[PDB]
């Protein structure tokens, strides 16, 4: 069922079970994970999920997109499917579930006979399963609630939550620092300082000498601030113009669109594919099939995908996507930093324009809505509705996401936190989510912190 209040609440109940599951995947027994490391991929990967072992919660985030794939599609004939009995839409939804399951199986180990995967890197079958129990309640919620047409405000809240958890997890992580400070920022602080530090705040910023060994953590505090000031400013611009409103009775409440609203959601997706692509590529090039001679032939040397003799993620797609990495401290590579900014900028504007059509806000959709809740007929002309309302809606959708996508690449350079790439994506989401949480609810706000 539709209801802004219901959709936010469902995401909240799920959210807790993510953390209860997490601890056993973390460190259990002697278990270790060999390679993976990076940050940008990790914040994306993190639909409430963190630690050394990859992709526990990952099929679950995906599932919502699968539902959109078919429920509001139609073209390639097989509508109403040659299936016995009948009953479509729910049938499409059932097909959607199968696609999610197929994705899951390949990562996890499977039995030797009928196996059809593996021989590379995988396993994590026990490790995945506890996350799967948390994410099963999400999947089951999606099945019932949707009934072949569904949407939901799932996406934003899970990813957003995780980074706050991660910073706390890092604090109790041992960095082979001396026995603990007892409340300075995790690590990098000498033994003499540590005994003092527990007692209360004094010392730290004003002192007589501290710190400086190999900081990791003064970078964390200043990271948040850079994002903090500009995000709030751009959640302030708006276009109004409504008068006489609600029909007669006449009484007016202003209609608000930020114009960074309905624009933000494509950008999160745009960041997400690219970061994942960078981690995976290594497997395709070196250890799958085919690309030995083919690599040499294709890669002229300018940069082409699955490039020969490339160490770290393969040259091509990855090569433009980043420079050393170096946490933004080496970027004077006139050829890497420049391409990174421009590629992301062009990709972001593409996904903003495709969001308009039938997956988000367009001027035709808004036309019908303002006919229902009646602006007073909006002051309007003799009929010529077709233009009127239209012109500032494609420009607004494009502009909103284009600004954020430009900013994100530069933001990595200025300073992400302990992670050094990870912060920026998560923080932006929390501000957007807060507006979904209370403003859409159209009455009161949050829930919890009461009892009963």
């Amino acid at each position: 069922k539709i209801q802004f209040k219901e959709k936010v609440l469902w995401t909240a109940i799920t959210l807790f079970i993510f953390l209860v599951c997490c601890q056993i995947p973390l460190f259990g027994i002697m278990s270790s994970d060999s390679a993976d490391p990076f940050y940008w991929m990790r914040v994306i990967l993190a639909s409430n999920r963190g630690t050394l072992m990859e992709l526990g919660i990952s099929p679950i985030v995906t599932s919502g997109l699968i539902m959109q794939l078919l429920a509001g599609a139609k073209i390639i004939e097989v509508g109403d499917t040659p299936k016995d009995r009948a009953l479509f839409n729910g049938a499409q939804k059932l097909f959607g579930m199968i696609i999610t399951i197929g994705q899951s199986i390949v990562y996890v180990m499977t039995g030797m006979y009928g196996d059809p995967s593996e021989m590379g890197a995988g396993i994590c079958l026990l490790i995945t399963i506890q996350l799967f129990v948390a994410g099963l309640i999400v999947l089951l919620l999606d099945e019932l609630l949707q009934k072949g047409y569904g949407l939901g405000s799932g996406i934003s809240l899970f990813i957003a939550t995780n980074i706050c958890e991660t910073i706390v997890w890092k604090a109790f992580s041992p960095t082979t620092v001396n026995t603990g400070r007892g409340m300075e920022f995790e690590g990098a602080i000498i033994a003499l300082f540590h005994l003092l530090a527990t007692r209360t705040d004094k010392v730290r910023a004003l002192r007589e000498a501290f710190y400086r060994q190999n900081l990791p953590n003064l970078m964390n505090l200043i990271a948040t601030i850079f994002v903090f000031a500009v995000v709030i400013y751009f959640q302030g611009f708006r276009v109004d113009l409504p008068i006489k409103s609600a029909r007669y009775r006449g009484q007016y409440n202003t209609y608000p669109i930020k114009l960074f609203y309905t624009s933000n959601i494509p950008i999160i997706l745009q960041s997400a594919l690219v970061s994942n692509l960078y981690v995976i590529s290594q497997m395709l090039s070196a250890r799958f099939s085919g690309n030995l001679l083919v690599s040499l032939l294709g890669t002229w040397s300018d940069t082409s995908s699955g490039g020969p003799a490339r160490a770290y993620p393969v040259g091509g797609l990855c090569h433009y996507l980043s420079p050393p990495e170096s946490f933004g401290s080496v970027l004077e590579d006139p050829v890497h930093a420049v391409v990174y900014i421009v590629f992301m900028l062009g990709s972001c504007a593409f996904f903003s324009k495709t969001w308009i059509e039938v997956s988000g806000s367009s001027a035709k959709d808004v036309a019908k809505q303002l006919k229902e809740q009646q602006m007073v007929m909006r002051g309007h002309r003799e009929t010529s509705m077709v233009h009127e309302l239209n012109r500032y809606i494609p420009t607004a959708a494009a502009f909103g996401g284009l600004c954020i996508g430009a900013l994100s690449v530069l933001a990595d350079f200025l300073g992400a936190i302990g992670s050094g790439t990870g912060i920026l994506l998560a923080v932006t989401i929390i501000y957007q989510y807060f507006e979904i949480f209370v403003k859409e609810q159209s009455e009161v706000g949050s829930m919890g912190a009461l009892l009963f």
Partner: peptide
């Protein structure tokens, strides 16, 4: 509509893998 969705789906597909 489908075409747009499919493009998005391919992008998504790698993430889970």
């Amino acid at each position: 509509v489908f075409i747009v969705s499919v493009g998005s789906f391919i992008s998504v597909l790698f993430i889970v893998i």
